C-alpha cells in the first residue's frame, strides 16, 4: 500500500541508492521506526509494508537527501526531506510518495489511488 | 522512446484524459505535428512514437491543462503547459516527460534513462 | 503589472542575467514580440510594460533557461521555459511569473493580484 | 536573517495567515522551540530572529499547511511541510525559505545570501 519514488532534477534520472526511513507516530507522540530501505535503480522503494500492518495513523517518510548529494560531490541545503501525512481508510488504498530533488530545493507529491 | 506522465496536485491522482500534442521543429522553424493522445487512467501516455521515427531534433510536448481544470470546474491560469527539449542520441535512450499540475502552477521534469 | 522572478535550485540563489522574451498573440494568431529584458542580481525583471500597454490578450513569457545553465557548465534538458496565459480579461491585474530552475526540471507559478 | 515566504498554487496568491514554527536542535538532540509566527497578507514572515540569536545550528522550519487548506475547504494530504537545514556554519548568512503549496503537493526552495 506504500511506495516511495525519488527523482534527481540535476541529472534527469532516478535517484538511486537513497536511504528512506518510514516512521509511525506513537501514542506518546514520538516517531517509531516502521520501514526502511534504499531506492532501486528505478528510484523506487517497494515492499515497505503490507495492508495488514499499514493501519490508519500519522506516518513520516524521511528521505536522506544530504547523503545522496554528497555522494555526487554536490553541496546540498537540506539535512533530509520529510513527508508527514495521515493514512486514511476512507480514501484510495495505495499511496505513492514521490520526491523530485535538487541541491537547494525539492518537490513532493502524493498519488493516492485504488 | 517517449512517454508522458501527468499528475494532479489538487486531487493527488493521475491526471486522466488530458490531451497531449507532440510537435517536431521543422527546417523553417515551424512546429510540425508529430504525435498525440490522451492520458490513460494512470496519467500516462505511451505509444507516441518509435525509435526509428524519434530522431534527433527539437520537440515540443504540449499538455492541455486548461481543459483538464475546466472539466473539474476549477479556473486555471495557464492556456497549456509546454515542454521544449532537444532529443540527443548520445544520451540515454528513453525519455519520460512528467508534469505535476496545479491550477496556477506546474512542475515538469525529464527522466532520461537507458 | 508584469514581473518575472527566476530562482536557481542548484545554487540556492536568484537566477541572474536570465533573458526573458514576452509575446502577445495577434489577431492573425501569430506571436508578436511584446517585450523583453534580463533578470537582475535579485533574479527579478521589472519594467517590461505599463498598465496602458498591457491590454487583454494571450501572452507567452519565454525564459531562456538553456543559455543560463550552459554558462554554469551544465548542459540542461529544456530549450526554454514558456508560460502562456490569458491576462487582463476581467480588467487590469498585476502578474508575477515565478520560475524555479534545475538542469532537468523547472517549476513555475503565478501570483495574480488586483490593485 | 531568516524569512519565510509561502505561496498558494491553487489560488495564485500569497498564502496568508499560515502558522510557522522554527526549532533548533539542542545539545541533547531534541528540537527546541526557537521562534514562531504567521505569514502576512504578502505571504511573508519577517522578524523571526536576529543575527545575534541565529547562531550556527540545525534548524527546522515547520509550515502548518494542513490548517491552511482546511480553512479553504480542502482536506489536504500532508500534516505540515518541514524544512530542515544547517545554518550559519560558515558564518552568518541570510536565508529565505520559500514554499509553494497545493493540497497534495508542495515544493520548497532556499535562497541563501551572504550580506
Ligand atoms: C515534476 C515532478 C514529477 C514527479 C514525478 N513523479 C513521478 C512518478 C513516476 C514517473 C515520473 C514521475 O515524475 C514528481 C514531482 C514531485 C514533480 O515535481
Ligand atoms: C515555482 C516556485 C516559485 C517560488 C517562488 N518564490 C518566490 C518568492 C518571491 C516571489 C515569487 C516567488 O516564487 C517558490 C517555489 C518553491 C516554487 O516552486
Burial class (CB in 10 A: 0-12, 13-18, 19+), D114: exposed
Residue from B1, B14, B2 nearest B99 by CA: B14
Cα–Cα distance between C60 and B58 in angstroms, integer? 19
How far does chain C reach from its first CA to its final CA, in angstroms? 9
Torsion of CA C95, C96, C101, C104, to 10 degrees: -20
Strand order, beta sheet including D78-87: A31-38, A19-25, A57-63, A78-87, D78-87, D57-63, D19-25, D31-38
Provide the residue range defining the domain that includes C99: 1-115
Long-range contacts of D76-81 (CB under 8 A, 24+ apart): D76/D103, D76/D104, D77/A85, D77/A110, D77/A112, D77/B12, D77/D103, D77/D104, D77/D105, D78/A83, D78/A84, D78/A85, D78/A110, D78/D104, D78/D106, D79/A58, D79/A84, D79/A85, D79/A86, D80/A84, D81/D106, D81/D108
- CA C70 to each of CA B57, B112, C6, C64, C66: distance values in angstroms, whole numbers, following the listed order: 18, 19, 16, 11, 6
CB hemisphere CA count around D2 (13 angstroms) = 26
Q: Is D68 helix (H, G, I), strand (E, B) or coil?
A: helix
Query: Considering Cα of C95, then D82, then A106, then C41, what sign does the dihedral take?
Result: positive
In our burial notation (b when 16+ CB lie closer than 10 A, e otherwise), range B9-42 reads: bbbbbbbbebbbbbbbbeeeeebeebbebebeee
Q: For residue D69, what is the enclosing H or E element? A: helix D65-70
Q: For residue D67, what is the enclosing H or E element? A: helix D65-70
How far does chain B reach from its first CA to its final CA, in angstroms? 10
Name the grid cell of A111.
498519488
Those residues of chain D whose CB sits closer than 8 Å to some CB in chain A are 58, 77-80, 82-86, 102, 104-110, 112
Q: Nearest-CA residue of chain A relative to B101?
A: A109
- Mutation target to probe the B interface, by most B beta carbons within 10 A, among D7, D10, D69, D78 is D10
Residue from D27, D30, D35, D52 nearest D97 by CA: D35
DSSP code string of D73-104: T---SEEEEEEEEEESBTB--EEEEEEEEETT
Residue from C107, C9, D112, D97 nearest A104 by CA: C9
Are B60 and B33 in contact, with CB atoms under 8 Å apart?
Answer: no
Hey, which residues does A55 pair with through a beta bridge? none
Are D101 and D7 in contact, with CB atoms under 8 Å apart?
Answer: yes
Report the number of distinct structural domains present in chain A: 1
DSSP code string of C34-97: EEEEE--TTSEE--S--TTT--SEEEEEEE-HHHHHHTTT---SEEEEEEEEEESBTB--EEEE
Cα–ligand 2 centroid distance for D11 (angstroms): 14
Strand order, beta sheet including B57-63: B31-38, B19-25, B57-63, B78-87, C78-87, C57-63, C19-25, C31-38
Cα–Cα distance between D9 and C6 in angstroms, integer? 17
C5 marked as binding residue: yes
CB hemisphere CA count around A40 (13 angstroms) = 9
Burial class (CB in 10 A: 0-12, 13-18, 19+), C40: middle
Q: Nearest-CA residue of chain D relative to C106?
A: D107
Q: C70 to chain A nearest CA, in Å?
A: 13
C102 touches ligand 2 (CB under 6 Å): no
How far does chain D reach from its first CA to its final CA, in angstroms? 9
C107 touches ligand 2 (CB under 6 Å): yes
State the structure-solving technique.
Answer: X-ray
Q: At a CB cut-off of 8 Å and minimum separation 6, what does D108 contact?
A: A105, A106, D81, D83, D97, D98, D99, D100
Name the grid cell of B60.
515540443
| DSSP class of C9 | T
D100 touches ligand 2 (CB under 6 Å): yes
Resolution of the model in angstroms:
1.3
Cα–Cα distance between D67 and D35 in angstroms, integer? 19
Are D14 and D42 in contact, with CB atoms under 8 Å apart?
Answer: yes
Are A19 and A64 in contact, with CB atoms under 8 Å apart?
Answer: yes
Are B18 and B61 in contact, with CB atoms under 8 Å apart?
Answer: no
Are D22 and D37 in contact, with CB atoms under 8 Å apart?
Answer: no
| DSSP class of A54 | -
Locus of grid cell 500597454:
C53
**Taking CB atoms and an 8 Å cut-off, how many pairs form between chains A and C?**
38
Q: Cβ contact (<8 Å) for D103 and B77?
A: no
Cα–Cα distance between D42 and B15 in angstroms, integer? 31
Q: At a CB cut-off of 8 Å and minimum separation 6, what does C71 contact?
A: none
Cα–Cα distance between A37 and A97 in angstroms, integer? 14
Name the grid cell of D56.
550556527
- CA C17 to each of CA A113, B4, B26, C38, C82: distance values in angstroms, whole numbers, following the listed order: 43, 31, 30, 5, 17
Query: Considering Cα of D89, then D90, then D92, then D97, what sign does the dihedral take?
Result: negative
Long-range contacts of B25-29 (CB under 8 A, 24+ apart): B25/B57, B25/B58, B25/B59, B25/B60
- CA A111 to each of CA A1, C109, D43, D111: distance values in angstroms, whole numbers, following the listed order: 11, 21, 27, 29
Which residues of chain D neighbour A9 with C-beta distances below 8 Å? Answer: none
Cα–Cα distance between D55 and A48 in angstroms, integer? 38
Cα–Cα distance between C98 and C112 in angstroms, integer? 11
Are D115 and D21 in contact, with CB atoms under 8 Å apart?
Answer: no
Instruction: State the Cα angle at D8 between B107 and D58, rounded to 5°.
Output: 80
Residue from C30, C23, C34, C41 nearest C83 by CA: C23
Q: What are phi and psi of B91, to 5 degrees?
A: -100, -175
Cα–Cα distance between A98 and A107 in angstroms, integer? 8
CATH code, domain with B102: 2.60.40.180
Cα–ligand 2 centroid distance for D107 (angstroms): 9
In our burial notation (b when 16+ CB lie closer than 10 A, e otherwise), range D62-76 reads: bbbbbebbeeeeeeb
Locus of grid cell 526509428:
B52
Amino acid at each position: 500500500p506504500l511506495m516511495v519514488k525519488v527523482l534527481d532534477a540535476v541529472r534527469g534520472s532516478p535517484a538511486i541508492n537513497v536511504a528512506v526511513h518510514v516512521f509511525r507516530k506513537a501514542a506518546d507522540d514520538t516517531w517509531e521506526p516502521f520501514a526502511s530501505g534504499k531506492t532501486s535503480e528505478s528510484g523506487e522503494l517497494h515492499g515497505l509494508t503490507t495492508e495488514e500492518e499499514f493501519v490508519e495513523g500519522i506516518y513520516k517518510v524521511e528521505i536522506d537527501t544530504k547523503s545522496y548529494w554528497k555522494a555526487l560531490g554536490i553541496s546540498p541545503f537540506h539535512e533530509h526531506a520529510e513527508v508527514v501525512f495521515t493514512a486514511n481508510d476512507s480514501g484510495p488504498r495505495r499511496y505513492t510518495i514521490a520526491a523530485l530533488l535538487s541541491p537547494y530545493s525539492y518537490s513532493t507529491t502524493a498519488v493516492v489511488t485504488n
